């Protein structure tokens, strides 16, 4: 039905002009991605070395890559083989073609997570709102199990589930991971998978504001200086008597 609700405005650490992006959070959010989110969501536009300078250290990132496997190049016959992932291959399609998603997932197709924060309005807020907030299907509404109920999601008939159910945890520094903290982190990491350039963008922006803020007055004084012969200028008309 064409009747719905729009997400509120959460105070992320990466909204409001010159603003980093919580990197310790991107990392916890990566954890959330690899453990709970990746099972049914592809992020095929992000590789392991992207996680380098950012959250993890070089060795750390390779170790994660190493872990599981992919279908590497042709064995000298004509069949491919398996090996421990390198730092250069992108995260890991759980479903081959599109219809495999339909098969293993009620008949629905779970959309890619490479962008998503830029592919849905409100961005991280919508994902945050889609995550944490889940509700009891009101009166006269007929779910049908495949579709769950979800405020925010258009139509209210979803197909996902709330895979945030307070846990299926992880941890480095051991953050008390409830559904809240586990959600914020995914979105924060999601921001980064959508817009990696985020930090630097805003850094150049700081420099751009400081420079423009210094060039603008100077170019103006250059201009009024030359125009001053004209702005200050006097006319007189002296016709023959």
């Amino acid at each position: 039905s064409d009747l719905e609700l729009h997400p509120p405005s959460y105070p992320w650490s990466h909204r409001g002009l010159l603003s980093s992006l919580d990197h310790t959070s991107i990392r916890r959010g990566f954890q959330v991605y690899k453990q709970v989110c990746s099972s049914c969501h592809s992020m095929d536009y992000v590789a392991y070395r992207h996680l380098v300078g950012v959250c993890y250290t070089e060795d750390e990132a390779k170790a994660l890559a190493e872990e599981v496997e992919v279908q590497d190049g042709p064995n000298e016959d004509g069949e491919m083989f398996m090996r421990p992932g390198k730092l250069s291959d992108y995260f890991p399609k759980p479903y081959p073609n599109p219809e495999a998603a339909r098969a293993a997932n009620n008949g629905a197709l779970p959309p890619d997570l490479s962008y998503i924060v830029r592919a849905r309005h409100g961005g991280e807020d919508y994902v945050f709102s889609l995550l944490t907030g889940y509700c009891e299907p009101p009166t006269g509404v007929s779910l049908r199990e495949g579709l769950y109920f979800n405020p925010y999601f258009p139509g209210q008939a979803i197909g996902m589930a709330p895979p945030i159910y307070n846990e299926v945890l992880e941890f480095d520094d051991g953050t008390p991971a409830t559904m809240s903290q586990v959600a914020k982190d995914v979105c924060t990491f999601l921001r980064w998978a959508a817009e990696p350039e985020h930090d630097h963008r805003k850094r150049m922006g700081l420099k751009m504001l400081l420079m423009m803020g210094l060039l603008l007055p100077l170019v103006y004084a250059m201009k009024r200086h030359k125009w001053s012969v004209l702005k200050s200028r006097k006319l007189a008309y002296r016709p023959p008597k």
Partner: protein, 70 residues
């Protein structure tokens, strides 16, 4: 799950959900909710009332939330 992770959302939501604007909204929810139940061949489905409540609740949630989160 059964008892022992202090979901901050739930905590802040309580205080939030409570509040005036949402009290009134939930009142209408219940009002309309009880109508829908009180019949058979009806269709005024109570979907709108829920969102209004949620909206009012959720704005106040955003404002008070993340403060605590680590």
């Amino acid at each position: 799950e059964e008892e022992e992770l202090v979901d901050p959302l739930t905590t802040v939501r309580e205080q939030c959900e409570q509040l005036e604007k949402c009290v009134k909204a939930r009142e209408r929810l219940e009002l309309c909710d009880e109508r829908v139940s009180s019949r058979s061949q009806t269709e005024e489905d109570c979907t709108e009332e829920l969102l209004d409540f949620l909206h009012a609740r959720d704005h106040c949630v955003a404002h008070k939330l993340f403060n605590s989160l680590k």
